[PDB]
């Protein structure tokens, strides 16, 4: 049953077999939930944490170590050669084991944020002829359901009959419609119509606001108009996050280097095992120097890269928990640092979705068919009774204004609605209306009694100024609302007896005929007429965009005797002279951080746009508000509806959404086709917005932003949520998006660039001919500890200070660019001779080593011959940790340089000094004092062939070690041309190290 609000309700109750007065029977019920089922939506599936696990594998990065270690392993089997894969392995399951527990963690914090209140109904079923409360997905297509004030929708109901005059129900959760849409049965003839024009139709996840009704449901479950939505956002498509891209494009790179350098180890090795040893085949040769070739790649790959990068990020999306925002994935905390397009909700997300008054004006002085207006202003945003009103900026009491202390009591009687104080979330809400709720926060505010709310608590400060007008003035029967009157009155008598009239101010003030200027009551002329209707259009057509009420009051109606109180045209008969007493100006106000944060968007290059569901005249003037628009600057190509972006030109539609900052009238699906066209572009777009018709977009988007008031159908599809509704935590995760890729940059390529110093020594002493410098079991404990204690180090940088101030990052520009590849390949070259020039210094040059020559040294497995060219050499002393522990404490060292000169990317070390990380500099101290730690234990120096050494070998560490910091210094200087406490402090250190005159004595080729 689709297009019921195009039928009458005869044919639509006649279509299910059921008759309102009855409603359904037993057996058509039972019948009935064979066929439609349960009237609730799927619950969404949780995935099993063995599936959880996957994604965390589906990661390049972690695809290369899995690899790497099961390439290592095989290697192995051809047990300390076991312990770089097993340790491997520890890492990649810690690794996702962090990533699996953050999610879960996630989902617990927002799940928390819903208030399980269980979903009921009232439906007329033939069991019993009076109305039964059953459970909502008890609900069958057919039912006949009344729903009254304060009820939320369980189903799509098609109406039959208004109980009530009117009926007023709230549907911003699933149109965005901030003002309350009144209903009728007749039926809406557009067969295609937009939820706004279904007149006659309440869909479920909505509230009724004033009457009460029935109808004959049309829908359930996945039927609904939120059922439709939510299987929306299930067949959108989710990418991966742009780190995770940046990362995989990084990926493919590091796979290319290893792929290169196992290649070019292998083909230069080529056509040298023919030679007399255990070969015979170039079959069986080339397996040889692939295994020499294969392992060199492997021990050019990172491996506590996804380990520190997940570091990086669990480190930040706690920071963002602190500002109540709730990451779900662990890349997504980068995502608001590259994010060019905001696109927001209005109601709701930009706006409060409470209606506030903040604008009132009464009678000041009225010499002569002119006057003077007292207008005030008010400060509150919410339904909570906090705010102060102001007469010319500036703190007044509304006590010693008698036109203000009459203002009130007509607000607080005439209006029907409340406003109550919940405790299990701690905010105030309304009741009935969110325009009359907007009166009684408002009487709160103005205390025209001066009543004392020092000691009283939230629940009954809620209405404690209402109900002590209520008790001066008691309410007698109501003249409701009609809508061709456009006004609304009450019959109230003193504990005289006058009479409280309220609505539309060019309605009610033509039939005002007097003024009450303070206690006076003067004859109102034409003259003062047009200044205050003046005033209202200033209020109603100005940018300062309000709905506007007028408040009058009759000094002398007739008595209950006389009134005939079943006419509609008779009540307007009844209020024909009254006195004008002022009006008021309410709205749905832009929270209070939503409006510096789109300057601060604005400043870091961040374009904010509205797409909302509401009409252009609301969005507009909240545009102009919040400052996304001048409060003179026209919007004629800059603000467009649903429609009028429909029959837009494709190149005009280009220009549409890159220079369009508004979308008014939107459908939930209109809502993802303009993400879908800002991310054609090639755009990071950030959706922000509550409620059911945002979670296309919000799923859509690069990342969607939630807030913790919106549709639990909002947070699923959404990978932030703000648990506290602050705008604010917007700007701050944008900071920490751009703080976090700016130090990941930084420690990816301090990692890489102590991987391929380890590759260029491997090689080096390979084709030099020298023993073993560097075994791979230290090569892990060097790339575990020492490495991954100064690059955690490394997230904890110092933020620029135009990180805020500069335009997002271009999407294309890898991490790793052309020139920050030759820049870790300078560095890479230079910890390949510098190791292996050390462990060659101690066998040539070195006093307390053997002074043995090039030859001497190139040709060390034939020592223990007769005499060749060995003489006086011992066998033993080219197996010596000597000179192991000379190659790893300057590999060490360096690193140690070379994270020093990481804390910026091209900042030189004088003008940022490193205690400006003071992580850094002691993870340092860390790294340097677990080094010493190997050397002079018991066992530790015999796992690591290493010893201690002195002070004159620990002084020709420094010396190799400490031009790095000269040899990217330099570098840095070039990279920008295209302090004095830390210069005194490096400068005995420099002075003390290189006063001694020493060198290396290699005569031959290196
Ligand atoms: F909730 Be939005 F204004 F569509
Ligand atoms: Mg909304």
Known sequence: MENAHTKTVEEVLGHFGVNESTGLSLEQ??????????????????????????????????????????????????????????????????????????????????????????????????????????????????????????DKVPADIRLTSIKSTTLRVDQSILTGESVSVIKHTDPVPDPRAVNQDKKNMLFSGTNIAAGKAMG??????????????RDEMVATEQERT???????????????????????????????????VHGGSWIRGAIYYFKIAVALAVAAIPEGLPAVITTCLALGTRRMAKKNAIVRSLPSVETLGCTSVICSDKTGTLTTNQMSVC????????????????????????????GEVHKDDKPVNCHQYDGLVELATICALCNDSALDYNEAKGVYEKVGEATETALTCLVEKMNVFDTELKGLSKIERANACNSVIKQLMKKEFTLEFSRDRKSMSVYCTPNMSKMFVKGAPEGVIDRCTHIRVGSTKVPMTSGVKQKIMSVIREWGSGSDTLRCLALATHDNPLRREEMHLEDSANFIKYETNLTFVGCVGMLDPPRIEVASSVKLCRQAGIRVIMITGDNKGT?????????????????????????????????????????????????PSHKSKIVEFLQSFDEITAMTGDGVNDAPALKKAEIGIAMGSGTAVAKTASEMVLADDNFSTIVAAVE??????????????????????????????????????????????????????????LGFNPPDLDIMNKPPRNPKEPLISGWLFFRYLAIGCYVGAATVGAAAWWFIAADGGPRVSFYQLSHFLQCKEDNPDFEGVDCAIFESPYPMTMALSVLVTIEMCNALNSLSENQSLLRMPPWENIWLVGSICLSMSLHFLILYVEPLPLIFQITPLNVTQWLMVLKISLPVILMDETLKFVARNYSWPFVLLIMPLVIWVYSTDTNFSDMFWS
């Open 736 to 793: 920490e998006g751009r703080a976090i890729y700016n130090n990941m940059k930084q420690f990816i390529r301090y990692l890489i660039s102590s991987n391929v110093g380890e590759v260029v020594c491997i090689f080096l002493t390979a084709a030099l001919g020298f023993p073993e410098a560097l075994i791979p079991v230290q090569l892990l404990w060097v790339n575990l500890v020492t490495d991954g204690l100064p690059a955690t180090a």
């Open 359 to 386: 604008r009132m004006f009464i009678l000041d002085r009225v010499e002569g068919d002119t006057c003077s207006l007292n207008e005030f202003t008010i400060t509150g945003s919410t339904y909570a009774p906090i």
């Open 619 to 667: 969005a507009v003037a909240i545009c102009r508000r919040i400052g996304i628009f001048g409060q003179d600057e026209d919007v004629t190509s800059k603000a467009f509806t649903g429609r009028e972006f429909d029959e837009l030109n494709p190149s005009a539609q280009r220009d549409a959404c890159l220079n369009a900052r508004c979308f008014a009238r939107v459908e």
């Open 29 to 150: 019920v039972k019948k009935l939930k064979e066929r439609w089922g349960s009237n609730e939506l799927p619950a969404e599936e949780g995935k099993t944490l063995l599936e959880l696990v996957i994604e965390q594998f589906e990661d390049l990065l972690v695809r290369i170590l899995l690899l790497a270690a099961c390439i290592s392993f095989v290697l192995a089997w051809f047990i300390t050669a076991f312990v770089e894969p097993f340790v491997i392995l520890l890492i990649l399951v810690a690794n996702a084991i962090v990533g699996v527990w953050q999610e879960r963690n996630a989902e617990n914090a927002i799940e928390a944020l819903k208030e399980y209140e269980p979903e009921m109904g009232k439906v007329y079923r033939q069991d019993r002829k009076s109305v039964q409360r059953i459970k909502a997905k008890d609900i069958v297509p057919g039912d006949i359901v009344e729903i009254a004030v304060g």
């Open 216 to 229: 004959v449901v049309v829908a359930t479950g996945v039927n609904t108009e939120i059922g439709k939505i």
């Open 242 to 276: 742009p780190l995770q891209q940046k990362l995989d494009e990084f990926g493919e790179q590091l796979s290319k280097v290893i792929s290169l350098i196992c290649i070019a180890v292998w083909i230069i090795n080529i056509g040298h095992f023919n030679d007399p």
